[PDB]
Amino acid sequence: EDSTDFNDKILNEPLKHSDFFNVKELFSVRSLFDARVHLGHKAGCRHRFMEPYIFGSRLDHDIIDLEQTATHLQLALNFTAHMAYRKGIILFISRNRQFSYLIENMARDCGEYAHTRYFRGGMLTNARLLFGPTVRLPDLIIFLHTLNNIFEPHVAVRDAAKMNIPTVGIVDTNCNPCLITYPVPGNDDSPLAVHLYCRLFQTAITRAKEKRQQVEALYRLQGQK
Amino acid sequence: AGSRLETVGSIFSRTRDLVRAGVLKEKPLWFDVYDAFPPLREPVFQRPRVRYGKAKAPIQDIWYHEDRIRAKFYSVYGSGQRAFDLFNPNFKSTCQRFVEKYTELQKLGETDEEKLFVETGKALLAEGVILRRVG
Amino acid sequence: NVESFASMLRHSPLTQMGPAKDKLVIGRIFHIVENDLYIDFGGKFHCVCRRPEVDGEKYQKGTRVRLRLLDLELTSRFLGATTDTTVLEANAVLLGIQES
């Protein structure tokens, strides 16, 4: 009797709004441009599945179309906020060691999880053996870098799909986005780009968790009286 | 009960179908969010193929009209001894200052190229700019 | 009257620079490992330059330096490869320190 009203006022209400958390106010094409998000790899490194998201090549250096990035980033941030609102487990994954420390801190601060270390065979597809039969896997995996250190796709991209976990991923021009649920074309190398991404996801996640508490608290106060 | 066939459809299509078949008793926490706010492309595995014959990538080289002026300026006067400061988003190099003056004089009706290039150098020299010809 | 991406790209200093070979740029040392200076100069990738023998102690984190660019990204395609190998760094020659 009271559960249907809970799920309707709290879980189903956010899904009726196009931007329930107002993640569009967090970034702009200019803010992305200042972080050098449009800078891609050289044309010789281009992946053919990234061609739709490329604005062009400036002297053999690919430029990422930030108009698309802004639209893709809006969806990825929106999905991430909704999953944080629903109290889903969010796991950040990246093998780029220049940013391992930064990413681990961002995860700890937002109350989520980070895996920046060597990824052992079967963390996702054999988790019950590795962790225990009652282990809960992540509900969302965010890749700040989708490639490993030998320039191949991070194994967790395939293994997240195998375990039916949606993935958000920054996809540079040499990356393969086919299996990434919510890809965001953007520069994955420059510290300004990576720092921006960590601020946006950290803020999206932190806002959605605070929104969940506000709604719950209001729903309880009104319930008693 | 589920499906780890990651190359068969997408996590959404595989999850939606097994929920209909009754194989999955409950929908995953992410399913309702994906349905309400789906991605632009459904994430379906694809195998990247190599181009052969007369197939070429659609990416185009980014060029501007002012690039012709920049190519000539670098040939005639070389790179300025002033250093580029790419951190300042409003930085203007000697070449860009040359290009802006070259653009102004063209809009005043001048149409010759060799004449529009010599008059531009004089204007900058009058303003105190250092233009050391490479040769 | 919202600026478009095409406008930002046209008027960006990196676009206006043209080719990077033999272009003088100002870099900033952001990371140091022994005598290896990691220098950002506004591009996608940093460059790594060895500490100069003269006035080596003047080069510290935050020190702004003058560079002569050679390549924004060092990449090469080797025989039997479908894509290009990249070392994920720019090629530049460290000239000295920038002072006012």
Binding site: - | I62, W63, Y64 | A6, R10
Partner: peptide, 26 residues
């Protein structure tokens, strides 16, 4: 449409091809 969009043309910064010491000589 938009004035700042890229325009199609040939590389203006392209360098000439290399030449041997005897290129152009009998």
């Amino acid at each position: 449409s938009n004035e700042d969009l890229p325009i199609s043309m040939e590389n203006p910064y392209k360098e000439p091809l290399k030449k041997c010491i005897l290129c152009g000589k009998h």
